Design an enzyme around this catalytic site. Structure first.
Site, short mmCIF file in Angstrom:
data_model
loop_
_atom_site.label_atom_id
_atom_site.label_comp_id
_atom_site.label_asym_id
_atom_site.label_seq_id
_atom_site.Cartn_x
_atom_site.Cartn_y
_atom_site.Cartn_z
N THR A 41 0.87 -1.20 0.00
CA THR A 41 0.00 0.00 0.00
C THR A 41 0.89 1.24 0.00
OG1 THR A 41 -0.36 -0.15 2.37
CG2 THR A 41 -2.10 -1.10 0.95
N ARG B 188 -8.96 -5.44 1.02
CA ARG B 188 -10.01 -5.50 2.08
C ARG B 188 -9.83 -4.37 3.09
NH1 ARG B 188 -8.59 -10.58 0.87
NH2 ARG B 188 -10.22 -11.78 -0.20
N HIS C 226 -0.12 -17.16 -4.72
CA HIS C 226 -1.21 -16.71 -5.63
C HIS C 226 -0.66 -16.36 -7.01
CE1 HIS C 226 -3.72 -15.74 -1.76
NE2 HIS C 226 -3.49 -17.08 -1.96
N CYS D 137 6.27 -22.32 -18.60
CA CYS D 137 6.12 -23.26 -19.74
C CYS D 137 5.27 -24.44 -19.28
CB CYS D 137 7.48 -23.76 -20.22
SG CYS D 137 7.39 -25.03 -21.52
N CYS E 54 7.71 -27.86 -19.83
CA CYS E 54 8.90 -28.15 -18.99
C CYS E 54 8.87 -27.42 -17.64
CB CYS E 54 10.20 -27.85 -19.73
SG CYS E 54 10.56 -26.09 -19.99
N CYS F 94 12.16 -26.54 -26.83
CA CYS F 94 10.89 -26.87 -26.12
C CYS F 94 9.70 -26.25 -26.85
CB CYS F 94 10.93 -26.38 -24.68
SG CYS F 94 9.45 -26.83 -23.76
N1 LIG Z 1 0.71 0.04 5.47
C1 LIG Z 1 0.05 -0.91 6.11
N2 LIG Z 1 0.51 -1.30 7.34
C2 LIG Z 1 -0.15 -2.27 7.98
N3 LIG Z 1 -1.25 -2.93 7.60
C3 LIG Z 1 -1.69 -2.52 6.39
C4 LIG Z 1 -1.12 -1.54 5.61
N4 LIG Z 1 -1.84 -1.40 4.43
C5 LIG Z 1 -2.83 -2.25 4.52
N5 LIG Z 1 -2.78 -2.95 5.69
C6 LIG Z 1 -3.65 -4.05 6.06
O1 LIG Z 1 -3.24 -5.11 5.25
C7 LIG Z 1 -4.28 -6.10 5.20
C8 LIG Z 1 -4.33 -6.74 3.84
O2 LIG Z 1 -5.51 -7.56 3.83
P1 LIG Z 1 -6.24 -7.91 2.46
O3 LIG Z 1 -6.48 -6.64 1.71
O4 LIG Z 1 -7.35 -8.86 2.76
O5 LIG Z 1 -5.11 -8.62 1.58
P2 LIG Z 1 -4.48 -10.10 1.60
O6 LIG Z 1 -3.14 -10.06 0.94
O7 LIG Z 1 -4.59 -10.62 2.98
O8 LIG Z 1 -5.53 -10.79 0.65
C9 LIG Z 1 -5.36 -12.24 0.40
C10 LIG Z 1 -5.83 -12.56 -1.00
O9 LIG Z 1 -7.22 -12.14 -1.16
C11 LIG Z 1 -7.42 -11.55 -2.45
O10 LIG Z 1 -8.58 -12.02 -3.11
C12 LIG Z 1 -6.12 -11.86 -3.23
O11 LIG Z 1 -6.11 -13.12 -3.88
C13 LIG Z 1 -5.07 -11.83 -2.12
O12 LIG Z 1 -3.85 -12.48 -2.49
C14 LIG Z 1 -5.57 -5.33 5.47
O13 LIG Z 1 -6.23 -5.93 6.55
C15 LIG Z 1 -5.13 -3.90 5.82
O14 LIG Z 1 -5.67 -3.48 7.04
ZN LIG Z 2 9.62 -25.36 -21.86
#
Ligand SMILES: Nc1ncnc2c1ncn2[C@@H]1O[C@H](COP(=O)(O)OP(=O)(O)OC[C@H]2O[C@H](O)[C@H](O)[C@@H]2O)[C@@H](O)[C@H]1O
Ligand SMILES: [Zn+2]
Ligand SMILES: NC(=O)c1ccc(O)cc1
Ligand SMILES: [Cl-]
Ligand SMILES: [Cl-]
EC number: 2.3.1.-
Length: 282
Positions: free
Chosen positions: A48, A56, A124, A132, A135, A161
């Site tokens: 961020t 979220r 993820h 690929c 391979c 390949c």
């Molecule tokens: N600077 C900061 N310092 C501390 N906390 C922070 C900051 N910025 C944001 N946060 C917190 O950081 C937290 C991030 O929570 P989420 O946003 O759910 O991300 P994920 O990586 O867990 O999401 C997982 C998967 O879901 C998706 O569908 C994708 O597939 C993702 O890969 C929040 O609660 C913020 O409060």
């Molecule tokens: Zn290959």
């Protein structure tokens, strides 16, 4: 995709007052000092501060969609710089205080920070990485792979390949990469300290991996502005910006946060660099 459970979005942020934050970051330093095997778990919150919105948080991708608004990017993925937190993690691996790093992030920033790929699980996928089908050879690109959901990118394998290159970005129905999950699971179970940074821990199995450390008396630290799914199981919860926590921690450990020379790919971890002698704790 449409009906996909996007979890609890836009919960209120929690800010530990300054005296409480300083104390908890000293306790985190004490835990790192005492631990044989430290595993870090990172999600969208660690990016961020480079202009990539989380999912979220108050202005997250899923939160804003719920309110009929749009997430805001202050960078392209290609122009995004690793945060103080990303570079702190590079250093912690280098001096041997980080055993493994488990990430839900697709933003490519751990790789691009020079973090060794053999100590990283990208649960993820990575937007800059294509694979690929024939391979399994991965290519770490200087620009985002233009597809998501494990589709053909249009490029062919170059291994001494012509296999179809595909993106590594999981869609909702796609199971996690077997190699990355297996290594992340082993790391977490064997850890005596798991530290979560900027993840709400709402995605299975990614979010559950830190709980595995708690088996056999391991300690769990959660660093997050919002509540997380597993807050109850944490030995320590720090509610603050992950850059403030990590800069303060590094200062306590007597470590500098290294310079970022630009995008650099490191396949394998080196033996640990020298690090400060440990304090007398008890
Ligand atoms: N600077 C900061 N310092 C501390 N906390 C922070 C900051 N910025 C944001 N946060 C917190 O950081 C937290 C991030 O929570 P989420 O946003 O759910 O991300 P994920 O990586 O867990 O999401 C997982 C998967 O879901 C998706 O569908 C994708 O597939 C993702 O890969 C929040 O609660 C913020 O409060
Ligand atoms: Zn290959
Ligand atoms: N591609 C996306 O929509 C996206 C959004 C936010 C992230 O943190 C990562 C990826
Ligand atoms: Cl998305
Ligand atoms: Cl971009």
């Amino acid at each position: 995709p449409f009906t996909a459970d996007k979890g609890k979005c836009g919960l209120p942020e929690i800010f530990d007052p300054p005296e409480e934050l300083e104390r908890k970051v000293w306790e985190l330093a004490r835990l790192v000092w005492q631990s044989s095997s430290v595993v870090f778990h990172t999600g969208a919150g660690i990016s961020t501060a480079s202009g990539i919105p989380d999912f979220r948080g108050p202005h997250g991708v899923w939160t804003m969609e719920e309110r009929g608004l749009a997430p805001k990017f202050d960078t392209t993925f290609e122009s995004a710089r690793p945060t103080q937190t990303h570079m702190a993690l590079v250093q912690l691996e280098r001096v041997g205080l980080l055993r493994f790093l488990v990430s839900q992030n697709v933003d490519g920033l751990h790789v691009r920070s020079g973090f060794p790929r053999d100590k990283l699980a990208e649960l993820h996928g990575n937007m800059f990485v294509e694979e690929c089908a024939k391979c399994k050879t991965q290519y770490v690109r200087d620009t985002v792979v233009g597809t998501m959901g494990l589709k053909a990118t249009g490029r062919l394998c170059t291994v001494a390949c012509r296999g179809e290159l595909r993106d590594t970005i999981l869609d909702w129905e796609d199971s996690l990469p077997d190699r990355d999950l297996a290594l992340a699971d082993e790391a977490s179970r064997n850890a005596d300290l798991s530290i979560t940074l900027g993840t709400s821990l709402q995605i299975r199995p990614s979010g559950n991996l830190p709980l595995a450390t708690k088996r056999r008396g391991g300690r769990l630290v959660i660093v997050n502005l919002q509540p997380t799914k597993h807050d109850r199981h944490a030995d320590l919860r720090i509610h603050g910006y992950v850059d403030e926590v990590m800069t303060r921690l590094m200062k306590h450990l007597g470590l500098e946060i290294p310079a970022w020379d630009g995008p650099r790919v490191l396949e394998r971890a080196l033996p640990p660099l020298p690090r400060p002698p440990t304090p007398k704790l008890e």
